[PDB]
């Protein structure tokens with residue numbers, strides 16, 4: 001199936017940092033009619049996954065302007081311009097371009113040492 | 114507000130069966146495609162099954178094929194998941210997630226219900 005490799009696995013941050021996390025697709029998301037159906041979820045600690053962005057760049061309902069997404073083909077990026085405590089948790093990318101719908105290896109956003 | 118509340122998890126012996134429920138509120142349940150996603154201890158997420166608003170399964174992983182059933186009760190605004198012959202690998206956090214037409218994917222997710230397979 002389509003493997004979604006997220007880099008880095010873990011990202012230590014300071015509040016107010018601007019970060020970019022990556023999602024690399026094992027196959028092109030532009031090979032069919034469903035071009036770059038690549039979404040991002042945030043699983044805050046002790047909470048359910050929440051939709052952040054879908055279809056690369058679309059901010060879901062309630063998602064602040066500090067979040068943005070880019071990419072086409074196989075390399076997608078999620079950028080957070082001023083990390084807040086509410087942004088910490090596990091970020092999973094997801095693809096619905098090819099059957100079946102798959103989930104990424106995750107990037108844990110956590111406070112730095 | 115869109116709400117999804119899963120239930121039915123607990124302890125199951127090796128080779129046992131589980132029946133999960135997910136009661137929906139804050140939206141017209143009957144017009145939405147629904148899914149079950151499990152999260153292993155490693156935090157890995159995997160789609161277990163998806164069903165159209167008509168009550169027709171639209172996806173099962175080849176591996177769970179034969180031991181899984183996804184159903185819905187539109188009138189009770191409830192989604193179900195049945196799994197048999199549980200093995201150690203079935204131990205997970207089971208989430209019900211709504212499917213969004215514009216996303217072509219999950220939008221809202223419940224709180225999950227834990228299934229712990231035992232020996």
Ligand SMILES: C[C@]12CC[C@@H]3c4ccc(O[C@@H]5O[C@H](C(=O)O)[C@@H](O)[C@H](O)[C@H]5O)cc4CC[C@H]3[C@@H]1C[C@@H](O)[C@@H]2O
Pocket residue numbers: 096098099100101144145146147163166171172211212213214215216217218219
């Ligand atoms: C899981 C899946 C990718 C996601 C696809 C999806 C995602 C959202 C969705 O939204 C639903 O869209 C319906 C429609 O298209 O009319 C609307 O009526 C509903 O309100 C809405 O819940 C419908 C569908 C249809 C089939 C799903 C695929 C089946 C698998 O093979 C594949 O891996």
Ligand SMILES: [Zn+2]
Pocket residue numbers: 001002003026
């Ligand atoms: Zn694969």
Ligand SMILES: [Zn+2]
Pocket residue numbers: 001002003
């Ligand atoms: Zn794979």
Ligand SMILES: [Zn+2]
Pocket residue numbers: 202
């Ligand atoms: Zn196995």
